């Protein structure tokens, strides 16, 4: 696009800053970094799957806080995988990225079983996992609804997209562009 439209994006990010940088959502990287990235993903989306290592590398660079917004819009399978991801988060936050990355690595469509195969491979017990789904159902539901509305409010109209600082990157953004913006802001 161009300057005028980027300026509007900056104003919207300020308007929704409490929502975008909400602290109750899962994050990796430096908790205390002022350079905060906020990623919006559907696990069944082809472009979301393909940037999984861009995300991993950008996080491992060490410079940012990266918040994960699970924004399922591609159907029942995505909602399941999204719900399951947060069900892991609330059991053990250190395992959320592992579910995240495995879900993105999961090439075919999700099924109840394949999601459990993932919960098993990352060290979580089926019964702890089932109790998490049920016990935290209201809060998971609330978090996903709030992310969907945020995606609507930002008007992007699909996934993936990534907010860093006052900028919004749409689609499979090259890693070098993200890194330059992060450095500029550091």
Residue numbers in the entry: 63 to 248
What sentences appear in the manuscript?
The introduction, isomerization and reduction of protein disulfide bonds in bacteria are controlled by disulfide-bond-forming (DSB) proteins. wMel strain encodes two DsbA-like proteins, α-DsbA1 and α-DsbA2, and the integral membrane protein α-DsbB. In contrast, α-DsbA2, which is highly conserved in Wolbachia, does not interact with α-DsbB and has a long N-terminal region compared with α-DsbA1. Our results show that FL α-DsbA2 is a strong protein disulfide isomerase and that the removal of the N-terminal residues eliminates this activity but gives rise to weak dithiol oxidase activity.
We used two constructs: (i) FL α-DsbA2, the full-length mature α-DsbA2 (lacking the signal peptide that directs the protein to the periplasm) comprising residues 16–252, and (ii) α-DsbA2ΔN, a truncated form of α-DsbA2 (lacking both the signal sequence and the 50-residue N-terminal region) comprising residues 65–252. We were unable to generate crystals of full-length mature α-DsbA2. The crystal structure of truncated α-DsbA2ΔN reveals a classic monomeric DsbA-like architecture. Using SAXS data, the molecular mass of truncated α-DsbA2ΔN was estimated to be ∼23 kDa from I(0) and the Porod volume, which is very close to the expected mass for an α-DsbA2ΔN monomer (21 kDa) and is consistent with the crystal structure that we report here. We next assessed the protein disulfide isomerase activity of FL α-DsbA2 and α-DsbA2ΔN by following the reactivation of scrambled RNase A in an in vitro assay. By comparison, truncated α-DsbA2ΔN recovered just 35 ± 3% of the RNase A activity relative to native refolded RNase A over this period, similar to that reported for the oxidase enzyme EcDsbA. Therefore, we conclude that α-DsbA2 is a protein disulfide isomerase and that its disulfide isomerase activity requires the presence of the N-terminal residues. Notably, there is a basic region near the catalytic site of both PmScsC and EcDsbC that is absent in α-DsbA2. A hydrophobic region is also present in PmScsC and EcDsbC, and the conservation of this feature suggests this is a binding site for unfolded protein substrates.
